[PDB]
Structure 1
Amino acid sequence: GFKQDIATLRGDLRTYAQDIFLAFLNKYPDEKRNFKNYVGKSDQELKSMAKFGDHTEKVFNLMMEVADRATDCVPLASDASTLVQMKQHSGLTTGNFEKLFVALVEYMRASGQSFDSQSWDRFGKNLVSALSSAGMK
């Protein structure tokens, strides 16, 4: 289930983080409005860019802690508040997060592994709800 999936992702997190983020950028190319340094680069070129690997790992590091602190795929209000109030998230809306979770769920469904894709879909929907409640537009 969901908790085992956090363990699975954490066991190879740099790789899963980059492949999920690439699945997001490739599914939703207009999302690069917020990542202008990633325009005009293939996946292998992005993996070679220091901030692509180091920021994407740090994003998934924190996402796995928010997932781990959740109860039944519902994040802590303190985690939602932190994600709204981060200066690096000043430009964002809940739709940016919805699209990331649609890509993460599609990636899990396409894998041969017994990921609990239904739980990740609920987590993404519950995180969006919590971000809205904490004041993200």
Structure 2
Amino acid sequence: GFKQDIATLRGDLRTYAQDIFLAFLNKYPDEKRNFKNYVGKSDQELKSMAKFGDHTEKVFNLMMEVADRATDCVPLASDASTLVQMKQHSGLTTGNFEKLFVALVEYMRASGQSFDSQSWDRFGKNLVSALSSAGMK
């Protein structure tokens, strides 16, 4: 289930973080509006840059902390507030997060690895609603 999925992801965190973020960027080409340094590079060209894996891995580390602290796939309001108030997230809207989790769930369902894709869809939806409640537009 969801708890095991956190363990699966953490067990190979850098690789999953890169592949899920790439799935997001490729599903939503307009979303590079927030990623000017990744324009004009293929998936393997991006994975070849240490800064890409370094940043993705730190992103998904925090995502796994928020997922692990959630109750029944409902994130804590304090974690949502953290994500809202991060300087790196100024100008984001919940639509940015909605698209990330749509791509993440799609990646999981296409994967050979078992994932509880329903729980991740719920987690993404509850994260969006919590981000809104914490003041994200």
Residue identity over aligned pairs, in percent, reads: 100
Per-residue Cα deviation, 1:56-79 (whole angstroms, up to 9, x for no partner): 100000000000000000001110
- Give the secondary-structure state (helix, strand or coil) at the position aligned to 2:125: helix
CA distance in 2, matches of 1:36, 1:48: 17
Q: Which runs of 5+ in 1 are unaligned?
A: none
Per-residue Cα deviation, 1:19-64 (whole angstroms, up to 9, x for no partner): 0000000000100011010000011110122321111100000000
> TM-score of the superposition, structure 2-length normalised?
0.98
State the match for 2:15 in structure 1.
15
CA-CA distance at 1:113 after TM superposition: 1.8
CA distance in 1, matches of 2:18, 2:51: 11
- Give the secondary-structure state (helix, strand or coil) at the position aligned to 1:73: coil
Higher mean alpha-carbon deviation, 69-78 vs 44-53, is at 44-53
Higher mean alpha-carbon deviation, 83-92 vs 46-55, is at 46-55
> TM-score of the superposition, structure 1-length normalised?
0.98
Give the number of aligned pairs. 137
State the match for 1:40 in structure 2.
40
Would you identify which runs of 4 or more consecutive aligned residues in structure 1 move more than 2 Å? Answer: none
CA distance in 2, matches of 1:15, 1:91: 28
Q: Which runs of 5+ in 2 are unaligned?
A: none
State the match for 1:117 in structure 2.
117
- Give the secondary-structure state (helix, strand or coil) at the position aligned to 2:54: helix
- Give the secondary-structure state (helix, strand or coil) at the position aligned to 2:59: helix
Per-residue Cα deviation, 1:76-104 (whole angstroms, up to 9, x for no partner): 11100000000000020000000000000
Higher mean alpha-carbon deviation, 97-106 vs 42-51, is at 42-51
CA distance in 1, matches of 2:94, 2:17: 20
CA distance in 2, matches of 1:88, 1:50: 20
